[PDB]
C-alpha cells in the first residue's frame, strides 16, 4: 503494502478514514481538507506513486478509480455535477505520492481549474 | 457517425482542424484553443461518450487510455516539472462539450482549490 505514505496508512485501515466505497482493488473516502461541499478521493490499493510513472498495463485500474468515482458521485447525490482531478508533481500541487483521484462538487467549479 | 455530433467528432473526422499531438485507434491528443496554462492539451476517446456520469463499467480500459496517453503526451512535451489533469461533469463542473475528455495543463504552477 500500500506504500509509505498516509494513504498507505489508510489503506491499511492504520488511521481513521470516512470511506465511501471499497473494493479488492481500490478504495474511496472523503478528503480532509475539503474544497467543496462534496470532495471525496479515489486511491488504487496498488501503490503508483504518481501518474507519469503508471503503465499501459494499470490502464484498466487507472478507469477503474474514474468509474468508481462516477458511481460514489452519483450516490453522494451530485446530480448537477462534478470534477475530477489528478495532481502531477510540483506544477500539479500533487501533495501526496501515492496516485489519487479528487472528485469535488456541490457548488459550482470554476474556470481555470487552478 | 463514428466520434459523434459534438465538435470532437468533427476533429476526430478531420472535419475541422486542430492541433494533434498523438492519434491512435481508440483516442486523439490535441491543444486547447483557449488554454488556461502554457500547455494546455485534451485527451478524447474516439468512441463517443457524453460525460464520464453515464460511461459503462465495460469503458474503463478506453477511460485508463486517455490519462496514459495523457502522461506520455506530458512527457514528450517535456512537462518535467508536472501538471494537472481535469474532467469536467455537467453544469457544476463546468462542462461544455458533451463528449468525455481530459483535460492536461502545466508549464505553470497550478494552484488550490482547483477552481
Ligand atoms: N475547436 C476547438 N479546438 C480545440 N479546443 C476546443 C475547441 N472547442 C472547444 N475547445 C476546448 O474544449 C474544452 C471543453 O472543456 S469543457 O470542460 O467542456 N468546458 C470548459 O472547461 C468550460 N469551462 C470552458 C475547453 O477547454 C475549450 O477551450
Same mark, same amino acid.
Given at each position: 503494502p500500500g506504500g509509505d505514505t498516509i494513504f498507505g496508512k489508510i489503506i491499511r485501515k492504520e488511521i481513521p478514514?470516512?470511506?465511501?466505497?471499497? &473494493? $479488492?482493488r481500490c478504495l474511496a473516502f472523503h478528503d480532509i481538507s475539503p474544497?467543496?461541499?462534496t470532495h471525496?478521493?479515489?486511491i488504487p490499493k496498488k501503490h503508483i506513486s504518481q501518474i507519469s510513472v503508471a503503465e499501459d &498495463? $494499470?490502464?484498466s485500474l487507472l478507469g477503474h478509480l474514474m468509474i468508481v468515482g462516477?458511481?460514489?458521485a452519483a450516490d453522494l447525490g451530485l446530480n448537477?455535477?462534478?470534477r475530477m482531478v489528478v495532481n502531477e508533481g510540483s506544477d500539479g500541487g500533487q501533495?501526496?505520492?501515492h496516485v489519487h483521484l479528487h472528485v469535488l462538487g456541490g457548488r459550482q467549479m470554476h474556470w481555470p481549474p487552478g
Open positions: 478514514a470516512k470511506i465511501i466505497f471499497e &473494493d $479488492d474544497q467543496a461541499p471525496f478521493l479515489v &498495463d $494499470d490502464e462516477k458511481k460514489c448537477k455535477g462534478y501533495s501526496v505520492y
